[PDB]
Amino acid sequence: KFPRVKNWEVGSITYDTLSAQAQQDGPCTPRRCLGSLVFPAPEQLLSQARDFINQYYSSIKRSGSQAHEQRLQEVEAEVAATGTYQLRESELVFGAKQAWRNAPRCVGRIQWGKLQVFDARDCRSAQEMFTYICNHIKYATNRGNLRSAITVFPQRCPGRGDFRIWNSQLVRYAGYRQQDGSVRGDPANVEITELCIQHGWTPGNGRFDVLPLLLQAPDEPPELFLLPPELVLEVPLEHPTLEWFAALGLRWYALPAVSNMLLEIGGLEFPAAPFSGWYMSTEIGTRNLCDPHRYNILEDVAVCMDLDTRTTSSLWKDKAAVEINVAVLHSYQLAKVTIVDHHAATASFMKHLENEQKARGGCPADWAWIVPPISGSLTPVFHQEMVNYFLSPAFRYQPDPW
Amino acid sequence: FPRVKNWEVGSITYDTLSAQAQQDGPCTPRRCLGSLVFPRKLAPEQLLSQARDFINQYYSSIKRSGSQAHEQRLQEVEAEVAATGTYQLRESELVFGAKQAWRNAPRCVGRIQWGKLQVFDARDCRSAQEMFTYICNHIKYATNRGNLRSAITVFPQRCPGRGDFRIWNSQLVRYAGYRQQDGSVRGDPANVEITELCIQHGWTPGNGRFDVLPLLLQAPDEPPELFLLPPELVLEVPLEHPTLEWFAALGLRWYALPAVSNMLLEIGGLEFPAAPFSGWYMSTEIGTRNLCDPHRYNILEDVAVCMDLDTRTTSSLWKDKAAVEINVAVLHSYQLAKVTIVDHHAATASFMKHLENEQKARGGCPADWAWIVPPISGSLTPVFHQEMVNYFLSPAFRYQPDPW
Ligand code: HEM
Ligand code: HEM
Ligand SMILES: Cc1cc(N)nc(CCc2cc(F)cc(CC[C@@H]3C[C@H](F)CN3)c2)c1
Ligand SMILES: Cc1cc(N)nc(CCc2cc(F)cc(CC[C@@H]3C[C@H](F)CN3)c2)c1
Ligand SMILES: Cc1cc(N)nc(CCc2cc(F)cc(CC[C@@H]3C[C@H](F)CN3)c2)c1
Ligand SMILES: C[C@H](O)[C@H](O)[C@H]1CNc2nc(N)[nH]c(=O)c2N1
Ligand SMILES: [Cl-]
Ligand SMILES: [Cl-]
Ligand SMILES: [Cl-]
Ligand SMILES: [Gd]
């Protein structure tokens, strides 16, 4: 009574036995599938803890031993005395890697074991927080040879407010409302841009203005910090055989670093745990630049390419989009900044799926997000059936602190 | 009532129709199985309950619920089943149920046309040679010398005891696939099995990679006999590219008429195991799926070689470039031959229009995001950023076991 899982390109079949351990409930019922939706005490804290502790001791091939019963005994003791408990550093590193490994919308998970974990649980203020973040950005960027990392700030605890990063990513471009009712810059960042303005930030008027950080220390208003310009590596976009493309003035940043997700580890919650990797070329080329509700350059490129934009049957959109993706890959390589194309990315995810079936008996995966947004069926994940479910440790969405 | 958002426009609706879904799918709160190709996995009291539901909405959709012939039609079905254990549909109900089953098909992107469907009633047929006639009429009326017209031919329903009408081919028009001396295929690998059956039931195999298969038609209880489609009834399109003159020399073609012939049509608790339907192609079905899938004709690297694309590295996006040109060639060829076809941008925008229509008429529309989104340029279409609810409504097309 585990689902059978077939790859239709190759004929392979597997059964997802891991989905039986799913430690939460999604939005789907037997009546109706909702897989496509973007947004799907002392005693329950104990069972999440116990399960996580059991997980940690399995991966160190020491389950059911002395140390295991001891650590299980310590935790309930501490939840009795304090209502919560503290992770050992090795548990935190393991918990943070498992969270990534468990993330169903991440096609990058072949890398989940190479994860640099920064322990900032001793963080005291918004100023210390900022220093940790610049240290993350510096390490992760590594002058173009990008490295995966995560910085863990102190956990939610009774008595104190949360540490929160208000920015959805550490590096984002401003989006300014215009006189045409429009947006100058990035329309997805209009709200945080208006929050930065009303917290003292003096805005620019360009299209690639890097936003300041809004950092919230517990029970403190958010404080504004400017990223030093030398810290944010950017890549100017040019096309290898379309020379007028460099005159569009387009840039993107090197480091994708998600900063508004909640990391959950054995019942403990970390509302601030930014993590960073490296880009897959379609996130920039296809989503960031071509989404109509983003930078929306697709017609401008196609017009410049002297394509026939009157009729859809000329496939001008598909043609413009492909060259924009080509320009992004060429540009990042010319600048020596790590980037993976959607063909290499999805081929390695398939290797991740086979590695995960042998170790855990399955792999949580959200097909609508794993398949790339152009050339879907040209990649090997298209023809692969996938099972989506929530394991813990996990990264979860959380409401905006404003 | 699930909230459903469109993330490119920001608009919000609620799907009230979903709650009126009955036959449960494969998902649970514990795990989503939306990506599976086969969800459902394949005392006449329950015939009456499906029959009365079907008659009720038949009478709702024409304002004539409460008083009138609506009362009287409910009694006739009652008596019909109490007498015979089954029942027969009025020709208007059969027409209505076929349009509903198309309208309810969650994977169909071309449902804006759901109201314009020619329904040939083939229920009074009792012969495989007769089936061949009906199929050949359908193909002629559907093809229409290239000006394609949606159509379905409804063969007799499954009756309790005694056999079943069935079409063994997956579609009415299929190319052969010939195994070799190394296990590779000449022609269409998707059809290596049914080609094997045609050979063992009589067919002399053919030349190469675009041989139209013979039909395999099964009258109830009798074995499937072969039938040979007359070549002038099978309109094909030789694929050329407008500016890549060598593309014609590749010798690729495709047929005009996509006609599915292995699905079961369910109306009012009745089942029609043979009910072949047809429409016209969306261009990516041919160029991207049939020609470019690795387990299909797999021509992608051949086209890239001739375009002198850097096949040494994936980062050149050579697969994306070749695929777009193959889709361009399909579109150009079909238009030159004046065979109805629709590109995936025109189709998905027609579907968004369908969704709004269906919002106002029924409070939503069942849609399968995985299949509605085209297989190239997905996020460039307006359906990509549209959240969608998948559920099962009746009437419906359903998968069924293969007759072997
Ligand atoms: C280093 C290479 C990485 C690559 C190539 C990568 C790629 C991606 C992509 C492409 C997506 C979805 C966006 C899309 O569909 O276009 C995604 C989602 C995600 N990734 Fe990865 N990622 C990487 C590193 C990481 C790391 C280091 C973590 C956590 C420690 C992580 C956690 C996540 C999460 C939680 C999501 C879902 C985000 C959401 O739902 O908003 N990823 N990743
Ligand atoms: C009129 C033009 C039509 C177009 C453009 C069209 C397009 C499509 C497409 C693109 C798919 C999914 C296959 C893919 O995306 O590669 C599909 C599936 C489907 N269509 Fe439509 N179709 C049309 C007519 C019809 C008609 C007339 C019927 C029935 C009366 C129908 C019933 C279905 C069904 C049942 C499926 C699901 C097939 C399956 O699950 O195997 N379609 N259609
Ligand atoms: C570490 C990392 C590396 C990488 N290379 N890529 C990513 C994913 C970035 C990404 C992609 C998306 F497609 C959408 C988002 C945010 C959308 C979600 C949806 C909810 F609204 C909250 N934020 C973020 C993360
Ligand atoms: C009338 C019509 C028009 C059109 N334009 N397109 C179609 C769909 C053709 C099609 C496309 C697919 F992508 C897959 C299938 C069959 C899939 C499942 C797998 C099972 F084996 C049985 N059917 C059929 C039908
Ligand atoms: C149906 C669907 C499928 C899919 N595969 N993908 C999407 C887009 C998901 C997405 C990606 C993003 F990158 C950003 C958003 C908007 C969410 C944030 C949260 C705040 F509200 C501001 N916008 C949504 C939608
Ligand atoms: C595994 C995956 O769900 C399956 O291959 C589906 C995905 N979406 C599809 N979409 C279309 N249009 N046609 C298909 O055959 C498929 N196959
Ligand atoms: Cl991004
Ligand atoms: Cl112009
Ligand atoms: Cl087909
Ligand atoms: Gd040039």
Ligand SMILES: [Zn+2]
């Ligand atoms: Zn589901």
Ligand SMILES: [Zn+2]
């Ligand atoms: Zn998008």
Ligand SMILES: [Zn+2]
């Ligand atoms: Zn395919």
